[PDB]
Amino acid sequence: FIDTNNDGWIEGDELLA
């Protein structure tokens, strides 16, 4: 996955990556 808001968690659009 790729974390697009750089928070350290995988959530939203990040889960389809």
For binding to Lu ion (CB under 5 A), which residues are involved?
3, 5, 7, 9, 11
CB of 7 to Lu ion, least distance (A): 4
Token digits of residue 4? 């697009």
Cβ-count burial 1-17 (b if 16+ within 10 Å, e if not): eeeeeeeeeeeeeeeee
CB of 15 to Lu ion, least distance (A): 9
CB of 1 to Lu ion, least distance (A): 9
